[PDB]
Amino acid sequence: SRIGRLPIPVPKGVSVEVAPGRVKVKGPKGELEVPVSPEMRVVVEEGVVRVERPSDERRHKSLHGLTRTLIANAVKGVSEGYSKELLIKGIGYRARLVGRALELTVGFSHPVVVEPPEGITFEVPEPTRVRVSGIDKQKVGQVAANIRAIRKPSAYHEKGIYYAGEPVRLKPGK
Amino acid sequence: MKTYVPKQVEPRWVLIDAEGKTLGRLATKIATLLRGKHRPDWTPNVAMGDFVVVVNADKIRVTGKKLEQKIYTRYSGYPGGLKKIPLEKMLATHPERVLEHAVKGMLPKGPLGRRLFKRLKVYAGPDHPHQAQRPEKLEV
Amino acid sequence: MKGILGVKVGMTRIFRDDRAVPVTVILAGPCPVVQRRTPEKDGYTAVQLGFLPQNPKRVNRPLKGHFAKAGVEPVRILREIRDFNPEGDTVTVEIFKPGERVDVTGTSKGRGFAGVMKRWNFAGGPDSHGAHKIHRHPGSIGNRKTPGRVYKGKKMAGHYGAERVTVMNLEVVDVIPEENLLLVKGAVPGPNGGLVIVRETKKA
Amino acid sequence: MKVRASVKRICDKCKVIRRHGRVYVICENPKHKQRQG
RNA sequence: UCGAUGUCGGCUCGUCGCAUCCUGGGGCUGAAGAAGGUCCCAAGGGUUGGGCUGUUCGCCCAUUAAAGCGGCACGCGAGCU
RNA sequence: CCGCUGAAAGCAUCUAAGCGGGAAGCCCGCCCCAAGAUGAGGCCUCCCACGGCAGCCGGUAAGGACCCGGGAAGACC
Ligand SMILES: [Mg+2]
Ligand SMILES: [Mg+2]
Ligand SMILES: [Mg+2]
Ligand SMILES: [Mg+2]
Ligand SMILES: [Mg+2]
Ligand SMILES: [Mg+2]
Ligand SMILES: [Mg+2]
Ligand SMILES: [Mg+2]
Ligand SMILES: [Mg+2]
Ligand SMILES: [Mg+2]
Ligand SMILES: [Mg+2]
Ligand SMILES: [Mg+2]
Ligand SMILES: [Mg+2]
Ligand SMILES: [Mg+2]
Ligand SMILES: [Mg+2]
Ligand SMILES: [Mg+2]
Ligand SMILES: [Mg+2]
Ligand SMILES: [Mg+2]
Ligand SMILES: [Mg+2]
Ligand SMILES: [Mg+2]
Ligand SMILES: [Mg+2]
Ligand SMILES: [Mg+2]
Ligand SMILES: [Mg+2]
Ligand SMILES: [Mg+2]
Ligand SMILES: [Mg+2]
Ligand SMILES: [Mg+2]
Ligand SMILES: [Mg+2]
Ligand SMILES: [Mg+2]
Ligand SMILES: [Mg+2]
Ligand SMILES: [Mg+2]
Ligand SMILES: [Mg+2]
Ligand SMILES: [Mg+2]
Ligand SMILES: [Mg+2]
Ligand SMILES: [Mg+2]
Ligand SMILES: [Mg+2]
Ligand SMILES: [Mg+2]
Ligand SMILES: [Mg+2]
Ligand SMILES: [Mg+2]
Ligand SMILES: [Mg+2]
Ligand SMILES: [Mg+2]
Ligand SMILES: [Mg+2]
Ligand SMILES: [Mg+2]
Ligand SMILES: [Mg+2]
Ligand SMILES: [Mg+2]
Ligand SMILES: [Mg+2]
Ligand SMILES: [Mg+2]
Ligand SMILES: [Mg+2]
Ligand SMILES: [Mg+2]
Ligand SMILES: [Mg+2]
Ligand SMILES: [Mg+2]
Ligand SMILES: [Mg+2]
Ligand SMILES: [Mg+2]
Ligand SMILES: [Mg+2]
Ligand SMILES: [Mg+2]
Ligand SMILES: [Mg+2]
Ligand SMILES: [Mg+2]
Ligand SMILES: [Mg+2]
Ligand SMILES: [Mg+2]
Ligand SMILES: [Mg+2]
Ligand SMILES: [Mg+2]
Ligand SMILES: [Mg+2]
Ligand SMILES: [Mg+2]
Ligand SMILES: [Mg+2]
Ligand SMILES: [Zn+2]
């Protein structure tokens, strides 16, 4: 019944060095930096990282589980790295890879080209499936959300952009 | 016996850094200096106060949501000329005026206090061209 | 941001592809750069151009002097073209190609102390049905006791015309280098023989 | 979105939120979604 | 306020409020689509010409993106009627 | 309004730390005025270091004003 106390199993060989207000992480896939509240404390242990709050005030309870999960996420990233699959539903709807960028053919009067920001790398195993991959989470999380917005799911048809494993809840017409 | 009246006195120049300092609680010391009410020879109807050279005025600090909710305003004389200006943007435009406007309102009204604000010189940044005055820096 | 000083000769029309194109002609060139504004020295970028040679008998010492430091012959008029830096010592209409677009400035004709039906296009009062000496009057200028005052920026009779006016996005119809003549489709302010500036357009 | 001074929960699935000084009411039934205004 | 603050409507000239008629941005929709309905944000600009009547208002003709409601002494007679 | 990551509150949550998208509307950009902006700004060139006794009087310089011929400028100015 608590996260800010759950340890953070740092998997070798990923580094963690504390610095007031932040924590930097290095991994087989790239660096990351976790800005962190000063009021907390990040404790380094063998192959484990924790975070201690200095009191049970509500404002310290909140930032606690928060900070643990940021660092924790930052570790899986530089090691496993995150990704997300997008599902394309729509007859004429395609999605091909343009060198490095992504053009989406989803019925508009035009192709929607999206340029990959730093860290993010687009990939296409299927003109129907898309896999966004990176080391950051609130970035891999964002970009994908952006792409899904171009042609969101519809309420009346399996037609649009869907998160992988996203329900197909539809309404009736007539 | 009558009260003492001080002949013309060579003013003194002060240098006050404002970085980190709180806005309204800095301008209260300045205006006091300007007024000269820190002098044993204070006199109401003369400019017997320091000159105040404020610096790093772009780094003044403030409490709460004021950058987003403190609305500096102007009235352009014409209809609809009510200019509503947030604190955030006065800094990102004309910062030396957040402090000025603050002290300005803490100085009396009329001529005197209108030429005391003149003795105030607030510059944004760590430097001032008043080196030729050798300002006596103060800590407050 | 190329631009050039010039005078207004007049306006006719020409034919271009079975079509009549109203044009106003301008004696733009040739303008010699008599000074270059700078950010370090003056704090901003521009070019002081000269236009119309002037009889040295009417030119005085400080002016004669300034014309010296620039190795520039005297001249009648001096205007700047902000954010403009020609590579050379002299500016000419050659800087304009046909089919381009320009913004034109001229000291509009002066209508003197003109009325309200003329400066502010008001409608005045009727010419009948009982109009008592108001056929060309404005009307009511305020309310009553609240606000009990008159607005600033209010529209009333007053001097109208003879004020700077900048016309924009005109078309370079043709340029006659031989004579320093710029043909621009449209209306250019001010009377003929008046001064005008021809600055590159800021529209798209 | 509904906007009213009587924000309440309509089903077992509704959830009462405070967001940005405001009280919303989110749910999987978009109808029940409310704001306090 | 009666040793006077002239009172309806119109014309002219505006300007503000926003409980928004239009254009703009949204949620829900018994939202398929187009077109509507209902709340929310928004007052920048716009909001026609006519027939009847002193008329405000309202009805009607032809239109429109729309033909909004209200405050300024039911704005405005040392400005007109 | 729509979200990303996300605790409190092992799930969930657009927010409590933080980052995005998004109105003809706010800010800038566009046109015009404007340093009496007495906070009276800046730049180019010109003039000079005159006599008598932060003031006065007198004669010049760089310049200007009056006077005149006039102007799509303008009631006079
Ligand atoms: Mg370790
Ligand atoms: Mg311990
Ligand atoms: Mg003190
Ligand atoms: Mg005191
Ligand atoms: Mg003083
Ligand atoms: Mg404060
Ligand atoms: Mg400034
Ligand atoms: Mg010409
Ligand atoms: Mg001119
Ligand atoms: Mg005239
Ligand atoms: Mg006109
Ligand atoms: Mg007219
Ligand atoms: Mg009329
Ligand atoms: Mg009539
Ligand atoms: Mg008429
Ligand atoms: Mg009569
Ligand atoms: Mg008459
Ligand atoms: Mg009138
Ligand atoms: Mg009256
Ligand atoms: Mg009043
Ligand atoms: Mg004039
Ligand atoms: Mg031709
Ligand atoms: Mg109810
Ligand atoms: Mg219930
Ligand atoms: Mg839910
Ligand atoms: Mg009386
Ligand atoms: Mg009475
Ligand atoms: Mg009376
Ligand atoms: Mg009386
Ligand atoms: Mg409203
Ligand atoms: Mg609308
Ligand atoms: Mg709409
Ligand atoms: Mg239907
Ligand atoms: Mg339908
Ligand atoms: Mg529809
Ligand atoms: Mg709707
Ligand atoms: Mg509006
Ligand atoms: Mg309106
Ligand atoms: Mg009508
Ligand atoms: Mg009739
Ligand atoms: Mg009736
Ligand atoms: Mg009837
Ligand atoms: Mg129609
Ligand atoms: Mg409509
Ligand atoms: Mg009444
Ligand atoms: Mg009544
Ligand atoms: Mg009345
Ligand atoms: Mg009236
Ligand atoms: Mg009358
Ligand atoms: Mg009347
Ligand atoms: Mg969600
Ligand atoms: Mg989430
Ligand atoms: Mg936040
Ligand atoms: Mg953003
Ligand atoms: Mg944002
Ligand atoms: Mg988005
Ligand atoms: Mg943005
Ligand atoms: Mg537009
Ligand atoms: Mg000007
Ligand atoms: Mg000046
Ligand atoms: Mg001022
Ligand atoms: Mg000057
Ligand atoms: Mg004359
Ligand atoms: Zn519900």
PDB file of N, CA, C and O in Angstrom, chain A residues 114-156:
ATOM      1  N   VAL A 114       4.788  13.256 -39.944  1.00  0.00           N
ATOM      2  CA  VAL A 114       5.172  13.594 -38.580  1.00  0.00           C
ATOM      3  C   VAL A 114       6.674  13.393 -38.455  1.00  0.00           C
ATOM      4  O   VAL A 114       7.184  12.300 -38.733  1.00  0.00           O
ATOM      5  N   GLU A 115       7.383  14.442 -38.038  1.00  0.00           N
ATOM      6  CA  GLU A 115       8.830  14.321 -37.883  1.00  0.00           C
ATOM      7  C   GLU A 115       9.174  13.805 -36.491  1.00  0.00           C
ATOM      8  O   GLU A 115       8.647  14.317 -35.498  1.00  0.00           O
ATOM      9  N   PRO A 116      10.038  12.799 -36.387  1.00  0.00           N
ATOM     10  CA  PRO A 116      10.391  12.251 -35.079  1.00  0.00           C
ATOM     11  C   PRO A 116      11.279  13.210 -34.309  1.00  0.00           C
ATOM     12  O   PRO A 116      12.383  13.548 -34.762  1.00  0.00           O
ATOM     13  N   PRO A 117      10.840  13.669 -33.139  1.00  0.00           N
ATOM     14  CA  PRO A 117      11.727  14.466 -32.286  1.00  0.00           C
ATOM     15  C   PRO A 117      12.896  13.627 -31.795  1.00  0.00           C
ATOM     16  O   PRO A 117      12.983  12.420 -32.032  1.00  0.00           O
ATOM     17  N   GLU A 118      13.816  14.290 -31.100  1.00  0.00           N
ATOM     18  CA  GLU A 118      14.974  13.597 -30.557  1.00  0.00           C
ATOM     19  C   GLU A 118      14.541  12.440 -29.659  1.00  0.00           C
ATOM     20  O   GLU A 118      13.439  12.423 -29.105  1.00  0.00           O
ATOM     21  N   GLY A 119      15.431  11.458 -29.531  1.00  0.00           N
ATOM     22  CA  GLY A 119      15.175  10.298 -28.703  1.00  0.00           C
ATOM     23  C   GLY A 119      14.212   9.316 -29.334  1.00  0.00           C
ATOM     24  O   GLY A 119      14.418   8.100 -29.267  1.00  0.00           O
ATOM     25  N   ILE A 120      13.157   9.832 -29.956  1.00  0.00           N
ATOM     26  CA  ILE A 120      12.129   8.990 -30.554  1.00  0.00           C
ATOM     27  C   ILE A 120      12.616   8.463 -31.895  1.00  0.00           C
ATOM     28  O   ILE A 120      13.260   9.180 -32.670  1.00  0.00           O
ATOM     29  N   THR A 121      12.308   7.197 -32.171  1.00  0.00           N
ATOM     30  CA  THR A 121      12.602   6.570 -33.454  1.00  0.00           C
ATOM     31  C   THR A 121      11.375   5.800 -33.908  1.00  0.00           C
ATOM     32  O   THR A 121      10.963   4.839 -33.249  1.00  0.00           O
ATOM     33  N   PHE A 122      10.793   6.224 -35.024  1.00  0.00           N
ATOM     34  CA  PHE A 122       9.622   5.560 -35.572  1.00  0.00           C
ATOM     35  C   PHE A 122      10.030   4.274 -36.279  1.00  0.00           C
ATOM     36  O   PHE A 122      11.154   4.142 -36.774  1.00  0.00           O
ATOM     37  N   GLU A 123       9.106   3.318 -36.320  1.00  0.00           N
ATOM     38  CA  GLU A 123       9.324   2.094 -37.076  1.00  0.00           C
ATOM     39  C   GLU A 123       7.985   1.524 -37.508  1.00  0.00           C
ATOM     40  O   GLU A 123       6.953   1.763 -36.874  1.00  0.00           O
ATOM     41  N   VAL A 124       8.015   0.773 -38.603  1.00  0.00           N
ATOM     42  CA  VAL A 124       6.803   0.228 -39.206  1.00  0.00           C
ATOM     43  C   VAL A 124       7.039  -1.223 -39.610  1.00  0.00           C
ATOM     44  O   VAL A 124       7.632  -1.480 -40.667  1.00  0.00           O
ATOM     45  N   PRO A 125       6.608  -2.199 -38.804  1.00  0.00           N
ATOM     46  CA  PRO A 125       6.633  -3.593 -39.269  1.00  0.00           C
ATOM     47  C   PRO A 125       5.492  -3.924 -40.213  1.00  0.00           C
ATOM     48  O   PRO A 125       5.584  -4.915 -40.950  1.00  0.00           O
ATOM     49  N   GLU A 126       4.421  -3.128 -40.206  1.00  0.00           N
ATOM     50  CA  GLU A 126       3.240  -3.364 -41.009  1.00  0.00           C
ATOM     51  C   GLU A 126       2.699  -2.000 -41.404  1.00  0.00           C
ATOM     52  O   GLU A 126       2.702  -1.083 -40.569  1.00  0.00           O
ATOM     53  N   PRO A 127       2.233  -1.826 -42.642  1.00  0.00           N
ATOM     54  CA  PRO A 127       1.559  -0.567 -42.996  1.00  0.00           C
ATOM     55  C   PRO A 127       0.290  -0.338 -42.188  1.00  0.00           C
ATOM     56  O   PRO A 127      -0.369   0.697 -42.337  1.00  0.00           O
ATOM     57  N   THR A 128      -0.066  -1.302 -41.336  1.00  0.00           N
ATOM     58  CA  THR A 128      -1.194  -1.177 -40.421  1.00  0.00           C
ATOM     59  C   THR A 128      -0.782  -0.956 -38.973  1.00  0.00           C
ATOM     60  O   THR A 128      -1.508  -0.283 -38.238  1.00  0.00           O
ATOM     61  N   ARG A 129       0.357  -1.498 -38.545  1.00  0.00           N
ATOM     62  CA  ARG A 129       0.850  -1.316 -37.187  1.00  0.00           C
ATOM     63  C   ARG A 129       2.022  -0.342 -37.181  1.00  0.00           C
ATOM     64  O   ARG A 129       2.781  -0.249 -38.150  1.00  0.00           O
ATOM     65  N   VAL A 130       2.163   0.381 -36.073  1.00  0.00           N
ATOM     66  CA  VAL A 130       3.248   1.339 -35.887  1.00  0.00           C
ATOM     67  C   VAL A 130       3.774   1.200 -34.466  1.00  0.00           C
ATOM     68  O   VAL A 130       2.998   1.037 -33.519  1.00  0.00           O
ATOM     69  N   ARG A 131       5.097   1.266 -34.319  1.00  0.00           N
ATOM     70  CA  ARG A 131       5.758   1.069 -33.032  1.00  0.00           C
ATOM     71  C   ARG A 131       6.641   2.277 -32.749  1.00  0.00           C
ATOM     72  O   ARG A 131       7.680   2.458 -33.394  1.00  0.00           O
ATOM     73  N   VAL A 132       6.228   3.101 -31.791  1.00  0.00           N
ATOM     74  CA  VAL A 132       7.019   4.245 -31.352  1.00  0.00           C
ATOM     75  C   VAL A 132       7.933   3.789 -30.224  1.00  0.00           C
ATOM     76  O   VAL A 132       7.486   3.137 -29.273  1.00  0.00           O
ATOM     77  N   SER A 133       9.215   4.128 -30.329  1.00  0.00           N
ATOM     78  CA  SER A 133      10.216   3.603 -29.414  1.00  0.00           C
ATOM     79  C   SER A 133      11.188   4.698 -29.002  1.00  0.00           C
ATOM     80  O   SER A 133      11.596   5.521 -29.824  1.00  0.00           O
ATOM     81  N   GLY A 134      11.555   4.693 -27.726  1.00  0.00           N
ATOM     82  CA  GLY A 134      12.487   5.668 -27.197  1.00  0.00           C
ATOM     83  C   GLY A 134      12.959   5.253 -25.822  1.00  0.00           C
ATOM     84  O   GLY A 134      12.659   4.156 -25.347  1.00  0.00           O
ATOM     85  N   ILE A 135      13.708   6.151 -25.181  1.00  0.00           N
ATOM     86  CA  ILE A 135      14.197   5.911 -23.828  1.00  0.00           C
ATOM     87  C   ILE A 135      13.329   6.642 -22.805  1.00  0.00           C
ATOM     88  O   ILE A 135      13.205   6.194 -21.660  1.00  0.00           O
ATOM     89  N   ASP A 136      12.737   7.768 -23.194  1.00  0.00           N
ATOM     90  CA  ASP A 136      11.874   8.525 -22.300  1.00  0.00           C
ATOM     91  C   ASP A 136      10.437   8.002 -22.370  1.00  0.00           C
ATOM     92  O   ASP A 136      10.014   7.404 -23.360  1.00  0.00           O
ATOM     93  N   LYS A 137       9.682   8.237 -21.291  1.00  0.00           N
ATOM     94  CA  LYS A 137       8.296   7.782 -21.196  1.00  0.00           C
ATOM     95  C   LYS A 137       7.286   8.896 -21.448  1.00  0.00           C
ATOM     96  O   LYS A 137       6.357   8.718 -22.240  1.00  0.00           O
ATOM     97  N   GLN A 138       7.444  10.050 -20.790  1.00  0.00           N
ATOM     98  CA  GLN A 138       6.501  11.128 -21.094  1.00  0.00           C
ATOM     99  C   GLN A 138       6.747  11.742 -22.460  1.00  0.00           C
ATOM    100  O   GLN A 138       6.134  12.765 -22.798  1.00  0.00           O
ATOM    101  N   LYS A 139       7.640  11.133 -23.238  1.00  0.00           N
ATOM    102  CA  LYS A 139       7.877  11.508 -24.625  1.00  0.00           C
ATOM    103  C   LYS A 139       7.339  10.450 -25.581  1.00  0.00           C
ATOM    104  O   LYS A 139       6.531  10.761 -26.460  1.00  0.00           O
ATOM    105  N   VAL A 140       7.772   9.195 -25.428  1.00  0.00           N
ATOM    106  CA  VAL A 140       7.122   8.094 -26.133  1.00  0.00           C
ATOM    107  C   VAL A 140       5.628   8.113 -25.851  1.00  0.00           C
ATOM    108  O   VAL A 140       4.805   7.842 -26.735  1.00  0.00           O
ATOM    109  N   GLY A 141       5.254   8.440 -24.614  1.00  0.00           N
ATOM    110  CA  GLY A 141       3.843   8.553 -24.285  1.00  0.00           C
ATOM    111  C   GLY A 141       3.158   9.664 -25.057  1.00  0.00           C
ATOM    112  O   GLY A 141       2.059   9.485 -25.585  1.00  0.00           O
ATOM    113  N   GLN A 142       3.804  10.827 -25.139  1.00  0.00           N
ATOM    114  CA  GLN A 142       3.220  11.974 -25.822  1.00  0.00           C
ATOM    115  C   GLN A 142       3.064  11.698 -27.311  1.00  0.00           C
ATOM    116  O   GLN A 142       1.945  11.500 -27.798  1.00  0.00           O
ATOM    117  N   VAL A 143       4.188  11.680 -28.031  1.00  0.00           N
ATOM    118  CA  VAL A 143       4.234  11.533 -29.483  1.00  0.00           C
ATOM    119  C   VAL A 143       3.135  10.598 -29.971  1.00  0.00           C
ATOM    120  O   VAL A 143       2.343  10.961 -30.848  1.00  0.00           O
ATOM    121  N   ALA A 144       3.083   9.389 -29.409  1.00  0.00           N
ATOM    122  CA  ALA A 144       2.033   8.446 -29.781  1.00  0.00           C
ATOM    123  C   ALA A 144       0.656   9.078 -29.629  1.00  0.00           C
ATOM    124  O   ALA A 144      -0.174   9.020 -30.544  1.00  0.00           O
ATOM    125  N   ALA A 145       0.397   9.690 -28.471  1.00  0.00           N
ATOM    126  CA  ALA A 145      -0.869  10.382 -28.265  1.00  0.00           C
ATOM    127  C   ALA A 145      -1.116  11.405 -29.364  1.00  0.00           C
ATOM    128  O   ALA A 145      -2.248  11.564 -29.836  1.00  0.00           O
ATOM    129  N   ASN A 146      -0.064  12.111 -29.784  1.00  0.00           N
ATOM    130  CA  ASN A 146      -0.201  13.069 -30.873  1.00  0.00           C
ATOM    131  C   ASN A 146      -0.627  12.371 -32.158  1.00  0.00           C
ATOM    132  O   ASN A 146      -1.590  12.783 -32.815  1.00  0.00           O
ATOM    133  N   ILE A 147       0.083  11.304 -32.528  1.00  0.00           N
ATOM    134  CA  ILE A 147      -0.234  10.587 -33.760  1.00  0.00           C
ATOM    135  C   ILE A 147      -1.672  10.092 -33.734  1.00  0.00           C
ATOM    136  O   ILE A 147      -2.398  10.196 -34.731  1.00  0.00           O
ATOM    137  N   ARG A 148      -2.113   9.550 -32.595  1.00  0.00           N
ATOM    138  CA  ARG A 148      -3.484   9.061 -32.505  1.00  0.00           C
ATOM    139  C   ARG A 148      -4.485  10.187 -32.721  1.00  0.00           C
ATOM    140  O   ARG A 148      -5.608   9.943 -33.176  1.00  0.00           O
ATOM    141  N   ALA A 149      -4.094  11.425 -32.408  1.00  0.00           N
ATOM    142  CA  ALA A 149      -5.012  12.551 -32.533  1.00  0.00           C
ATOM    143  C   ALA A 149      -5.261  12.925 -33.988  1.00  0.00           C
ATOM    144  O   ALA A 149      -6.336  13.437 -34.317  1.00  0.00           O
ATOM    145  N   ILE A 150      -4.283  12.684 -34.867  1.00  0.00           N
ATOM    146  CA  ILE A 150      -4.435  13.041 -36.276  1.00  0.00           C
ATOM    147  C   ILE A 150      -5.762  12.521 -36.815  1.00  0.00           C
ATOM    148  O   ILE A 150      -6.543  13.264 -37.423  1.00  0.00           O
ATOM    149  N   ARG A 151      -6.035  11.231 -36.597  1.00  0.00           N
ATOM    150  CA  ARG A 151      -7.295  10.597 -36.991  1.00  0.00           C
ATOM    151  C   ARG A 151      -7.695   9.654 -35.854  1.00  0.00           C
ATOM    152  O   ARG A 151      -7.464   8.445 -35.906  1.00  0.00           O
ATOM    153  N   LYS A 152      -8.298  10.225 -34.812  1.00  0.00           N
ATOM    154  CA  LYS A 152      -8.687   9.462 -33.632  1.00  0.00           C
ATOM    155  C   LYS A 152      -9.617   8.311 -33.990  1.00  0.00           C
ATOM    156  O   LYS A 152     -10.150   8.258 -35.106  1.00  0.00           O
ATOM    157  N   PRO A 153      -9.833   7.373 -33.070  1.00  0.00           N
ATOM    158  CA  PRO A 153     -10.893   6.383 -33.269  1.00  0.00           C
ATOM    159  C   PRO A 153     -12.235   7.074 -33.443  1.00  0.00           C
ATOM    160  O   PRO A 153     -12.448   8.193 -32.972  1.00  0.00           O
ATOM    161  N   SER A 154     -13.145   6.396 -34.129  1.00  0.00           N
ATOM    162  CA  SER A 154     -14.499   6.893 -34.301  1.00  0.00           C
ATOM    163  C   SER A 154     -15.438   6.196 -33.325  1.00  0.00           C
ATOM    164  O   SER A 154     -15.110   5.169 -32.724  1.00  0.00           O
ATOM    165  N   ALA A 155     -16.623   6.777 -33.162  1.00  0.00           N
ATOM    166  CA  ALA A 155     -17.639   6.205 -32.293  1.00  0.00           C
ATOM    167  C   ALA A 155     -18.560   5.234 -33.016  1.00  0.00           C
ATOM    168  O   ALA A 155     -19.349   4.547 -32.359  1.00  0.00           O
ATOM    169  N   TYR A 156     -18.473   5.150 -34.345  1.00  0.00           N
ATOM    170  CA  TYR A 156     -19.411   4.362 -35.129  1.00  0.00           C
ATOM    171  C   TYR A 156     -18.741   3.311 -36.007  1.00  0.00           C
ATOM    172  O   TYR A 156     -19.450   2.538 -36.663  1.00  0.00           O
TER     173      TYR A 156
END
